[PDB]
Amino acid sequence: CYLRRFFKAKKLIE
Amino acid sequence: CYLRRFFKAKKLIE
Amino acid sequence: CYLRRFFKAKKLIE
Amino acid sequence: CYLRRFFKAKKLIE
């Protein structure tokens, strides 16, 4: 339930 | 003006 | 450089 | 599992 949070920022730099 | 949005996911897994 | 991080959660519940 | 995401914006303006 945190990926959405850790990823939401990842997609911004991937 | 974005690191905050990106790092915000870093502190979540550091 | 933060409103983005404030109104973002807003639209999600407005 | 989103409140944390929605609220995280709340404490930022309360």
Chain A residues within 8 A of B12 when measuring between CB atoms:
2, 5-6
C-beta separation of C4 from D13 below 8 A: no
Residue C9's nearest CA partner among A12, A10, D2, A13 is: D2
Q: What 3-state class would DSSP assign to A14?
A: coil
- In the PDB record, what is the listed experimental method? NMR
Question: Between chains, do C13 and D5 touch, taking CB under 8 Å as contact?
Answer: no
Subunits next to D (3 or more Cβ pairs <8 Å) are A, C
Q: Which of A5, A6, A8 is the best substitution to test chain D (most D C-beta atoms within 10 A)?
A: A5
Question: Between chains, do C10 and D12 touch, taking CB under 8 Å as contact?
Answer: no
The owner of tokens 């914006």 is: D9
